[PDB]
């Protein structure tokens, strides 16, 4: 139509249009108005020129004001006069910084001055949390951010697809020299070999692997070659049980465990010419292993026996209380006088509970 | 951890056509809106386009509409941007950028940035 | 124009201290807020924190929230970021940038950046 101050004929789309009143008003009125008000008149003076019909005297729209006029301000006064908006703003109706948001959803920043927990972003207006930032659906009212995005997450269903491999990922690879952590199943080689210490250590137990000649554990027998020292009750041992004697540890201590999905898909890194590529296992997934090729189904179940901190040694027979004894105490046992097989598993059981604790940084839960 | 490599920047005369892509890991590509922005020489940056998760919705900047084209193959974890008619004022360091969720920034990561010559 | 001078980075052990500076000019610096974004070996740039323009508000990466803390002073122009707890993933450069209210750009200029390593 026309600009509302001057008069000027001008096409709509020339103009700007004043979101409380509705007022036509060219770019040159529009911007010397609202800079000379800031740079010689008070806040409260910021109204529109053509008619003052916002009510700025009142403390109950001059919030919701000032966010919307803030976004025709910014685009059309220059830099230090758009400043001066938000100092004279804090100084003489916040007392504080104004809250600006950013929309996740459409990169777009706005003050929001409002009580509700759900901010709609004046560009694509839709609604979300201001703590979280999610889309806000009405399953977020009365609940925490953490149980919306918990809920969020198990019910997607690109997430339930993947089945256990989320789980034997989200149970991370901590370096324990540098501390960097790894979103990696273990896998099937145990010797892990970190990329900003160099550090080499199992990735079941975090004991190190020693270069040769650099073992310092007592009594060891392979100091001349590349090893690590294992508990009992590491991966890297109770990888060599059957999947039924695992779950066997497991049933004995009432612990569950899946043996259909809630070829494989757990995740692994590849080295390729330019870093590293993500290639599933792939390998076979045979029933009754819920999904998971036999190697990362076992460590699957090696990982619920460490979180319940399952003692491997309570299936053993005299054979491996034998190797035991020798392994973790450094002497060969021998029968007693009087002593069955019974007695003499029972106390080399004993011995070896009381004596050599299960793995000390195993990854418990 | 969290990579953004974009590529395809390089010399095109102007009316030309070009296409960046970013390639993206360490997060749930699907999950997160996504960005470009550039940074012409000497000058401010600026942005250009962003793509909702799953890329229902786009959004550009205002100089750039109907000649940019953004859009993302979540399967391929990868965004892209088709430029066309390329003027002068775009030649800039280009960035992708993810969306984020976290208080007090939009974008929470970038690239490292395509170099994009307008003769 | 916007000038943005970093300084304070070097050499940490792990689970020490440092503490980074940045001198600004060029610009009205209490308009606007400020931020620290940091480059990782082999990535581009990572949101670090955010202060508002008078430091009513502090936003931090998950990653380094309660062990780092941003402040400013802007009776001198000066952005600072004390690290605290460092570890061998913080090793980057690390940028002072000069917030903006612009859509999609919460900073438009970043300085020219300090080297952070964390030995081991
Ligand atoms: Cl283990
Ligand atoms: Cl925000
Ligand atoms: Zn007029
Ligand atoms: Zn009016
Ligand atoms: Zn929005
Ligand atoms: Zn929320
Ligand atoms: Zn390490
Ligand atoms: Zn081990
Ligand atoms: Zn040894
Ligand atoms: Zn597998």
């Known amino acids: 139509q026309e600009c509302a101050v001057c008069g000027w004929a001008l096409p709509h789309n020339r103009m700007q249009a004043l979101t409380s009143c509705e007022c036509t008003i060219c770019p040159d009125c529009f911007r010397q108005h609202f800079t000379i008000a800031l740079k010689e008149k008070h806040i409260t003076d910021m109204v529109c020129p053509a008619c003052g019909r916002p009510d700025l005297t009142d403390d109950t729209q001059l919030l919701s004001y000032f966010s919307t006029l803030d976004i025709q301000l910014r685009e059309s006064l220059e830099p230090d006069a758009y400043a001066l908006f938000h100092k004279k703003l804090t100084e003489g109706v916040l007392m504080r910084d104004p809250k600006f948001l950013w929309c996740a959803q459409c990169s777009f920043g706005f003050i929001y001055e409002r009580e509700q927990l759900e901010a709609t ?54 370096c324990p020299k540098c501390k960097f952590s790894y979103a990696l199943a273990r896998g099937g080689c145990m010797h892990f070999h970190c990329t900003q210490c160099r550090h080499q250590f199992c990735s079941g137990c975090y ?14 027998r392979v100091k001349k070659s590349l090893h690590g020292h294992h508990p009992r009750d590491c991966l890297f041992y109770l990888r060599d049980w059957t999947a039924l004697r695992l779950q066997k540890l497991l049933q004995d201590n009432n612990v569950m465990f899946n043996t259909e ?78 002593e069955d097989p019974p007695a003499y598993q029972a106390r080399l059981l004993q011995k070896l509970t009381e004596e050599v604790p299960l793995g000390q940084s195993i990854p418990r839960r | 951890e969290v990579q953004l490599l974009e590529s395809g920047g390089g010399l095109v005369q102007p009316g030309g056509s070009l296409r960046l892509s970013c390639a993206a890991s360490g997060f749930t590509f699907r999950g997160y809106s996504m960005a470009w922005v550039r940074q012409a020489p000497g000058k401010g940056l600026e942005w250009v386009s962003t793509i909702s998760p799953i890329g229902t919705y786009t959004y550009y900047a205002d100089s750039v509409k109907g000649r940019f084209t953004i859009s993302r193959d979540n399967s391929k974890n990868t965004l892209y941007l088709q430029m066309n008619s390329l003027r002068a004022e775009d030649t800039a360091v280009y960035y992708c950028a993810k969306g984020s969720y976290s208080r007090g920034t939009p974008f929470d990561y970038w690239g490292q940035g395509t170099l994009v010559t307008v003769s």
């Open chain 1, 121 to 174: 972003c004046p560009q694509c207006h839709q609604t979300f949390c201001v703590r979280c930032k999610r889309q806000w659906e009405e399953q977020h009212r009365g609940r925490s951010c953490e149980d919306f995005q918990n809920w969020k997450r198990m019910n997607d269903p690109e997430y339930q697809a993947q089945g256990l491999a989320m789980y034997l990922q989200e149970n991370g690879i901590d």
């Open chain 1, 207 to 220: 004991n190190a692997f020693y270069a040769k000649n650099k073992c310092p554990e007592p009594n060891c």
């Open chain 1, 261 to 338: 999905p809630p070829g494989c898909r757990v995740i692994e890194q590849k080295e390729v010419p330019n870093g590293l590529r993500d290639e599933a296992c792939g390998k076979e997934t045979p029933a009754g292993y819920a999904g998971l090729c036999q190697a990362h189904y076992k460590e699957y179940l090696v990982s619920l026996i460490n979180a319940h901190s399952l003692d491997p040694a309570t299936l053993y027979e005299v054979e491996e209380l034998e190797t035991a004894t020798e392994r973790y105490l450094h002497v060969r046992p021998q029968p007693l006088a009087g």
